Amino acid sequence: GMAVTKVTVDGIEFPPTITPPGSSKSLTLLGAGVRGIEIEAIQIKVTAIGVYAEPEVIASHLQKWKGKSASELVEDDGFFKDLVQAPVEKLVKITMIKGLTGSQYGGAVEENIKDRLAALDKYSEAEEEALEEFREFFKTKSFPKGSVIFFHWSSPSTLQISVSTDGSLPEEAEATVENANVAAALLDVFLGKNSVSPSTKASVAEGISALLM
Ligand SMILES: [Cl-]
């Protein structure tokens, strides 16, 4: 259904619902957490991550996981696979805890995606082109402390990206990357076996367990 309570990550509030930029639908918060980004081996930067999906992911697509505890879901790789494969709209909201240039952020996440694609043997030139669109978008942006990125999977292969320096929710999506493998790999970056954020995965297992009841 629809979550009622916000989750706060390093002081940053994630609301229990969000309407993706340009969208009419409201997505429910599933969980939130943190990850680190390495800049030149001398700096580790932190981002806060919030994971949202259509309410329907609970009512329909994750019914087989009913009655499991959070502490039963977090170790089950099949559970997170079902989540990332669910045919529903999803949104990941990123807040910059301290500042990054667009190229700094974009480059780090691009490498996360590339590494996942190579592990799957799905890093050809269709994906290479898509990742350059991804890189080119982020190179133009600035992410001072408190800025936000909205990654919106509006379809299984359609990644809509929006940003705002003041943390406000944009009225429309700004860029779109259409590539099935890149879209799926970015979901894996956050929620897969090799996730950059065990804390987000644990929170999402808790939030889904609660919603399933
Ligand atoms: Cl991130």
Residues 30-50: b if buried by 16+ CB within 10 A, e if exposed = bbbbbbebeeeeeeebebbbb
Helix H or strand E encompassing 160: strand 158-164
What separation in Å is there between the alpha carbon of 86 and the centre of ligand 1?
A: 21
Helix H or strand E encompassing 45: strand 43-53
**How many Å apart are CA 53 and CA 105, to the nearest integer?**
24
What separation in Å is there between the alpha carbon of 125 and the centre of ligand 1?
A: 24
Integer CA distances (angstroms), 76 to 82, 180, 191, in order? 10, 24, 12
Integer CA distances (angstroms), 24 to 20, 28, 89, in order? 8, 13, 11
- Residues β-bridged to residue 148: 95, 164
C-beta of residue 209 within 8 angstroms of C-beta of residue 150: no
C-beta of residue 48 within 8 angstroms of C-beta of residue 10: yes
**How many Å apart are CA 157 and CA 154, to the nearest integer?**
8
What separation in Å is there between the alpha carbon of 67 and the centre of ligand 1?
A: 31
**How many Å apart are CA 60 and CA 129, to the nearest integer?**
35
Question: Considering only CA atoms, which of 150, 161, 156 is closest in space to residue 182?
Answer: 156
User: Strands 175-178 and 142-143: what pairing?
Assistant: unpaired
What residue ranges define each of the domains in the chain, with the CATH number in brackets? Answer: 1-55+86-190 (3.50.70.10), 56-85+191-213 (1.10.890.20)
Helix H or strand E encompassing 117: helix 102-119
What separation in Å is there between the alpha carbon of 143 and the centre of ligand 1?
A: 12
Please give the full DSSP string across 6-43, using - where no structure is assigned. -EEETTEEE-SEE--TT----EEEEEEEEEEEEETTTE
Structure resolution in Å? Answer: 1.5
**How many Å apart are CA 84 and CA 131, to the nearest integer?**
20
- Residues β-bridged to residue 44: 38
**How many Å apart are CA 129 and CA 21, to the nearest integer?**
24
What separation in Å is there between the alpha carbon of 101 and the centre of ligand 1?
A: 13
What separation in Å is there between the alpha carbon of 49 and the centre of ligand 1?
A: 6
Question: Considering only CA atoms, which of 39, 112, 80, 72 is closest in space to residue 193?
Answer: 80
**How many Å apart are CA 47 and CA 144, to the nearest integer?**
12
What separation in Å is there between the alpha carbon of 35 and the centre of ligand 1?
A: 6
**How many Å apart are CA 150 and CA 178, to the nearest integer?**
16
User: What is the identity of the amino acid at 64?
Assistant: K
**How many Å apart are CA 44 and CA 38, to the nearest integer?**
5
- Could you tell me the two tokens for 174? 């700004």
What separation in Å is there between the alpha carbon of 137 and the centre of ligand 1?
A: 15
